[PDB]
Amino acid sequence: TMMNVIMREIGKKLDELSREFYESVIPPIDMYEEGGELVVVADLAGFNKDKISVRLSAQNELIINAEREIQYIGTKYATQRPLKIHKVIRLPVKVKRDSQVTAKYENGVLTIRIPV
Amino acid sequence: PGTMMNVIMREIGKKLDELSREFYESVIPPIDMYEEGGELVVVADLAGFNKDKISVRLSAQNELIINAEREIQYIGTKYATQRPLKIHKVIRLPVKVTAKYENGVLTIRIPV
Amino acid sequence: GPGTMMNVIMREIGKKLDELSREFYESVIPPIDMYEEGGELVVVADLAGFNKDKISVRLSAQNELIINAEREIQYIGTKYATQRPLKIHKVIRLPVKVKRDSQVTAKYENGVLTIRIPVEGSVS
Amino acid sequence: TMMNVIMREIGKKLDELSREFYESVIPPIDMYEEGGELVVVADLAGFNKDKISVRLSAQNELIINAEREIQYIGTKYATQRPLKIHKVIRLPVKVRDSQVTAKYENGVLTIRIPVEGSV
Amino acid sequence: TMMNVIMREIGKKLDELSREFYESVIPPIDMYEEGGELVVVADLAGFNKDKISVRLSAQNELIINAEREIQYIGTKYATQRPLKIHKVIRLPSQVTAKYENGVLTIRIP
Amino acid sequence: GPGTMMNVIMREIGKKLDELSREFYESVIPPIDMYEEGGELVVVADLAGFNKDKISVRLSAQNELIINAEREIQYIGTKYATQRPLKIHKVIRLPVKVRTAKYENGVLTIRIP
Amino acid sequence: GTMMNVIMREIGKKLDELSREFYESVIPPIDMYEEGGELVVVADLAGFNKDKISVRLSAQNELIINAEREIQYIGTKYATQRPLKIHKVIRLPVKVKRDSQVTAKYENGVLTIRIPVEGSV
Amino acid sequence: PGTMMNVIMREIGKKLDELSREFYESVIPPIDMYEEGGELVVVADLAGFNKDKISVRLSAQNELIINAEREIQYIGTKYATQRPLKIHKVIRLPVKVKRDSQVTAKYENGVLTIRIPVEGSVS
Ligand SMILES: [Cl-]
Ligand SMILES: [Cl-]
Ligand SMILES: [Cl-]
Ligand SMILES: [Cl-]
Ligand SMILES: [Cl-]
Ligand SMILES: [Cl-]
Ligand SMILES: [Cl-]
Ligand SMILES: [Cl-]
Ligand SMILES: [Cl-]
C-alpha cells in the first residue's frame, strides 16, 4: 500500500507534503556489506536514542521503530515533521537471529551493524 | 482479455516500493512552520550535514531556499543508496516578508 | 518554484521502468500475428521455452482465443533478475466470426506456436 | 523513454498491443551468476542464429540484437511479433574486453559471460 | 488545493470517505437565473438556521458559511457528517435566503 | 524550458475540479455517522431535498446496509451549474455482526440490531 | 479511443516533443458560439488545402470535420509533429436542421463554419 | 460498495473531454523539424495570427522560442473558446546553433516556417 501513500500527495506542491506521507517514507537508508557485517545507515534528525528501537522478525527482514512528540507553538503552517516511524527492510543475506545487533545514533544519523 | 492500464498500475506499485536516492533528494526535508512573536520558524530534519555546507537564503519572490552538500564513501558492495548527496529545498512563505543547526535539525528564525 | 511532487513521481517511475517485472511479462507475452487467408484465421505466437504438452489452446464460449501455458524453472546460484514468465494465460478476441468448436490446430516449432482456425462461412 | 513506449499503449487491451512496444520490450531476461560465470537467459522465438548478434559495450551494459523478416499473407489483423530486437542490459557483476558464449535453442537464447574471479 | 482534497481519499472505499473530505465538498449547488434574478440551490443537512451565514466578501464572489456541533453517544464507528462548511461559489447587491427541509436557497439581482 | 505535458495535465484538471460533476456527487452521498448505543447500530445521513416517499432503505444479503433514494428536478432559465445529485445509491459495510428509519430536516436516521 | 487516453499517453513527455498521433486527435482548437440565429464554429487548421477538408453533419446531432494532407519530409528529420489526418467530431450544444445551408470558408489556416439554428428565420 | 479510484477516474475523464483554451496555448503549435543544407528548419501550424504579432527568438540555452499574441472579440453566447490567444512555445534544438546567427521566418496560410543556421555552417 506504499503506492497509495505517494498518490495522496500528487496534487501537492513540494512545500506542502503531508506528515502522514513523511511517516511512511522516512527514513532513507544506505545499506551495504563489509567483512561479514551487514551495515544500515538511516537518517533521523531530531530524535532520541531512548525512543529508537530495532528488531528482526522471523521472516528475514530488519525492522526499525522510533517515536517522538512535538509541542505545537503559535500560528501553525506545517505539520510535516513525523512523530511515529515504522520501517521494514527486506534482507538480501539473512543474518542469524542469534547474532548480536549494535546501533549507534549520532548527529541525527542512525547506524546499525549486523553480523552475517 | 484484460487492459494495459491495469498492468501499468500493477507495475508502478512494484516500482515505488523502494525509492531512489534522487527521490529523497527532492522530498527532504520535512518541515514545521509556525509564527511566534513576529518570528517565523522553519524546522528541518536533515541527515547530518556539516553546518558550514548548509546554506540558507531568502529569494526575491518571497521564497525561502534551503541547500546543502554532502559527500559519502560507498565502502564495499552497496545494496542500497537512499541517502541524498545534495539538497535543494524551496519553501514558500505564508506571511509577508539567523540559523541554528543542532542534532541534524535545522531551525530557521525569520523576523516579522 | 517549490517543485511538483507529481514531477518527482514521474521522474521516479521512469528510471525504474528500465527494468520490468516478471509479472509484467506474464501479462504481456506473447506477441501474435493474426491474418485471414483462404477462409481461415491464422495466429502465430512467440512462446520460447515452454514444452508442447504444457501449452494448451482453447476456443472460448465467447468469440475469443485463449492460449495457456505453464512451466517450472530451476533457480541455481545468485539470481539478480528473473523477467521471463513461468505461467502464461493469454486472451485474444477474434476479428471475424469463427466456427465454434474443435477445428483449430496448433503447431509448435522453434519456440513458435502457430494456430490455424477456420473462419465462419468457410467452404469445405 | 522506455516509459514512453509503455504510455503509448495505455488505452489498448492486452490483445491489441503494438509491435513497436514488443520490439521495445522483448526479450524477458533471466540473469544470474554461478561458477564464476554470469548467465543471461532470454526468450526469443522465431529467429535464426545467424540473425542474432551479441555485443558487450565499453560501459557496463550488455547488448542483444536480433533481426528478422516477415511474410504476411492475406488480410491481416494483428502484426505484433517484433522484427528488430535491441536490448541494452546493465549487468551488476563486473565484467572492457571479454569472451562471451551464446547458444540458441527452442527460441531460448543463453549467454554466458565470465565474472572476475572464481572459475 | 481542491484536487488535493480528492486525492487524500483515493485509497478509501466509498463508505470510508472522510469527514474533512465532506466539509470541503458540501454543498452541491444548482445555479440558475430567472427574470434578471439570480437563484442558488444548495443541499445542506442537519444545520440550524441561525448558524448558517451568507455574504459576498468580493465584488464577484459568493460565500456560504455554516457551522454545527455534534455530540456522539456510544462507541462511534464513523464520523462523515461535516461540522463546518465554507463553500465559496463564484458569481458570474442584495441576497435573500430561506433554508428549509435541508435545501438552502439564495436570491440575487 | 519546454515545459512538461504532465504539468499541463495537472493544471488542466485542477481548474475544472472547482465545479464538480453531479454524477460524482451521486456516488459520494450521503455522509453518514455510524455508532452503536443500547445494543443497537444507528446511522445518521445527510440527504437534503429528497422526499420521504422517494427514500428507500434496504438490508443486503451480504453484510452491507443499503440506502436508496431518488428525486426529480426541473431547471428554469439558463443553468450555469447543476451539481445537485438526482439518483443516490449509498452502500455501507458493517463493523459489528447484524436482520426501521426516520427522516426529518433532510437527515435520515436508521436503527438496526 | 477515448479523449482521456490520448492525453495520458503523453504524460511522460515534455511539451516540445509531443506525439503527432496526439496532435491528430486534438487538432483543431475551436471557438463555438450561437449568434443571430446561427451557430458559428471557428477552427484553427493551418497548412491545409480546402479541397482536402470536408464537413459532415452527423446522424446524431454533431458536426464532423475531416481534413487530410501529405507532407514529404526533406532532409534529416528530428521532429515530425504536424498532423496528416484530421477527424474532429464536435457535439453540438443546440439542435440544428440537417437540411441546412451551412457555409464553411477556409482562409489563412482558419476554418469558419456557420450553421442555421432550428427555429430561426 | 464502490471505490474512490473508480470514482476519481470517471471524474478525471469528464474534465478532459472538453479542453481549456489555456491548454492549447501550451500545446500549440505542432512543429516539423529537419536539418538540411547545414541549416535547421522549423515549420509550425500557427493558424490565425498577424505576421506583425509573431516574434521568434533564439534562446541562450540553444532552444527555439515562438511567441504569438492575438486578440479575439467574442460575440453572442459562447459555448467554447478552445482557440489560443497567447502562445509561447519553447523547442529544444537537436543540434548546436549560433545565438548570434541571423534567422529568417516566413508566414503563409497560417504556417510559420523558420530557418536557422546550424553551428559550423558556411554563409
Ligand atoms: Cl513494530
Ligand atoms: Cl540558488
Ligand atoms: Cl481458461
Ligand atoms: Cl548498436
Ligand atoms: Cl451519422
Ligand atoms: Cl467518418
Ligand atoms: Cl546535410
Ligand atoms: Cl534566455
Ligand atoms: Cl520570451
**Which residue type sits at G33?**
Y
Q: How many Å apart are CA H38 and CA H115, to the nearest integer?
A: 10
Find the discontinuities in chain F where C to next N exceeds 2.5 angstroms and give the residue preceding each.
98, 99
Asked if A9 contacts E8 with a C-beta cutoff of 8 angstroms, the reply is: no
**Which residue type sits at C60?**
S
Q: How many Å apart are CA B4 and CA E96, to the nearest integer?
A: 53
Query: Could you write out the DSSP letters of every residue in G33-64?
Result: EE-SSEEEEEEE--S--GGG-EEEE-SSSEEE
Place of cell 513525523: A82
Q: In what order do the strands lie in the sheet with A102-106?
A: A102-106, A109-115, A37-43, A29-33, B77-81
Query: Which CATH number, 2.60.40.790, 3.40.50.970, 1.25.10.10, 3.10.20.70, labels domain C1-124?
Result: 2.60.40.790
Asked if E67 contacts E77 with a C-beta cutoff of 8 angstroms, the reply is: no
Ligand at minimal distance from the CA of G87 is 6
Asked if H58 contacts H17 with a C-beta cutoff of 8 angstroms, the reply is: no
CA nearest C110: which of D44, D52, D23?
A: D44
Q: Which residues of B touch A74 (CB under 8 A)?
A: 34-37
H87 class by beta-carbon count within 10 Å (0-12 exposed, 13-18 middle, 19+ buried): buried
B/E touch flag: 3 or more CB pairs below 8 Å = no
Asked if B15 contacts C16 with a C-beta cutoff of 8 angstroms, the reply is: yes
Q: Dihedral sign for Cα F5, F10, F16, F20, please.
A: positive
Q: Which residue ranges of G make up the annotated binding site for Ca(2+)?
A: 10, 17, 21, 70
Q: How many Å apart are CA H105 and CA H42, to the nearest integer?
A: 9
Measure Cα distances from A112 to A25, A109, B20, B105, C16 in Å: 19, 10, 21, 21, 27
**Which residue type sits at F35?**
Y
Ligand 7 centre distance from Cα of residue H94 (Å): 14
Measure Cα distances from F47 to B108, E30, F29, F52 in Å: 48, 15, 7, 10
Q: Which residue in E10, E15, E17 is closest to H5 by CB distance?
A: E10
Q: Which residue ranges of E make up the annotated binding site for Ca(2+)?
A: 9, 16, 20, 69
**Chains sharing 3 or more CB pairs under 8 A with chain F:** A, C, E, G, H
D61-67 and D84-90 beta bridge pairing:
antiparallel
- Residue B56, all three cell numbers: 540558507
Q: Is A61 annotated as a binding residue?
A: no
For chain H, how far is it from start to end, CA to CA, in angstroms?
A: 72
Cross-strand partners of B3: D13
Query: Could you write out the DSSP letters of every residue in C108-124?
Result: EETTEEEEEEEBTT---
CB contact under 8 A, F3 and G12: no
Asked if G118 contacts G44 with a C-beta cutoff of 8 angstroms, the reply is: no
Q: Chain C within 8 Å of G15 (Cβ-Cβ)?
A: no
Identify the residue among B23, B42, B90 best suited for mutation to test binding to C, counting C beta carbons within 10 A and taking the highest.
B23
CA nearest H114: which of H44, H14, H47?
A: H44
H/D touch flag: 3 or more CB pairs below 8 Å = no
Q: Which residues of A touch C1 (CB under 8 A)?
A: 13
Ramachandran angles phi, psi of B80, nearest 5°? -150, 150
This PDB structure is determined at a resolution in Å of 3.1
Identify the residue among G7, G9, G19, G34 best suited for mutation to test binding to F, counting F beta carbons within 10 A and taking the highest.
G7
Q: How many Å apart are CA A32 and CA A92, to the nearest integer?
A: 10
CB contact under 8 A, G14 and F8: no
Distance from the B56 Cα atom to the nearest Cα atom in chain A, whole angstroms: 16
3-state helix, strand, coil in chain H (%, to 5): 15, 40, 40
Q: Chain C within 8 Å of A14 (Cβ-Cβ)?
A: yes
Q: Is A23 annotated as a binding residue?
A: no
Q: Which residue in A17, A34, A107 is closest to B75 by CB distance?
A: A34
CB contact under 8 A, E13 and H1: yes
Interhelix angle B4-15/C5-16, rounded to 10 degrees, is 90
Looking at domain A1-116, its CATH class is mainly beta
Q: How many Å apart are CA E30 and CA E42, to the nearest integer?
A: 7
Q: How many Å apart are CA E40 and CA F46, to the nearest integer?
A: 19
Q: Which residues of F touch A12 (CB under 8 A)?
A: none
User: Which residues have a beta carbon within 5 Å of ligand 5, which is an ion?
Assistant: G 58-59
Q: Write the CB contacts of H100 (distance below 8 Å, at least 6 apart in sequence).
A: none
Ligand 1 centre distance from Cα of residue B19 (Å): 21
Q: Chain E within 8 Å of A10 (Cβ-Cβ)?
A: yes
Q: How many Å apart are CA F106 and CA F99, to the nearest integer?
A: 26
Whether omega for the bond prior to residue B29 falls within 30 degrees of 0, making it cis, is yes
Any idea how long chain F is? 113
- Residue B16, all three cell numbers: 515505488
CB contact under 8 A, C23 and B1: no
Q: What is the three-class DSSP state of A86?
A: strand
Asked if C44 contacts D39 with a C-beta cutoff of 8 angstroms, the reply is: no
Measure Cα distances from F54 to A87, E37, F57, F64, F67 in Å: 51, 30, 10, 21, 11
Measure Cα distances from B71 to A21, B30, B86, D13, D89 in Å: 27, 21, 8, 47, 29
Measure Cα distances from F35 to E70, E77, F43, F90, H55 in Å: 13, 5, 7, 17, 66
Q: In what order do the strands lie in the sheet with A52-57?
A: A52-57, A61-67, A84-90
Query: Which CATH number, 2.60.40.790, 3.50.50.60, 1.20.210.10, 3.30.70.20, labels domain D1-119?
Result: 2.60.40.790
Helices (H), strands (E): how many in chain B?
Answer: 2, 8
What is the CATH code of the structural domain delimited by E1-109? 2.60.40.790
Q: Which CATH architecture has domain G1-121?
A: Sandwich (2.60)
Asked if B31 contacts B44 with a C-beta cutoff of 8 angstroms, the reply is: yes
- Number of other residues whose CB lies within 10 A of the CB of residue E44: 23
Distance from the F84 Cα atom to the nearest Cα atom in chain E, whole angstroms: 5
Measure Cα distances from H3 to D11, E10, E13, F92 in Å: 21, 8, 4, 12
Helices (H), H1-116: 4-17, 21-27
Q: What is the three-class DSSP state of F64?
A: coil
Q: Write the CB contacts of A46 (distance below 8 Å, at least 6 apart in sequence).
A: A68, A81, A108, B43, B45, B103, B104, B105
Ligand 6 centre distance from Cα of residue G104 (Å): 18
CA nearest A47: which of A31, A32, A27?
A: A27
- Chain G residue closest to D1 (CA)? G12
- Number of other residues whose CB lies within 10 A of the CB of residue G18: 21
- Residue D3, all three cell numbers: 516509459
- DSSP character at residue A45: T
Q: Which residue in C3, C12, C93 is closest to B1 by CB distance?
A: C93
CB contact under 8 A, H90 and G16: yes
E17, containing H or E segment: none
- Residue G57, all three cell numbers: 453533419
Q: Which CATH architecture has domain F1-113?
A: Sandwich (2.60)
Which fold does the domain B1-112 belong to in CATH? Immunoglobulin-like (2.60.40)
Q: What is the three-class DSSP state of D105?
A: strand
Q: What is the three-class DSSP state of B9?
A: helix
Place of cell 462523515: E80
Q: Which residue ranges of C make up the annotated binding site?
A: 12, 19, 23, 72
Asked if E42 contacts E28 with a C-beta cutoff of 8 angstroms, the reply is: yes
Looking at domain H1-123, its CATH class is mainly beta
- Number of other residues whose CB lies within 10 A of the CB of residue C27: 19
CB contact under 8 A, H15 and F17: yes
Domain boundary assignment for chain H: 1-123
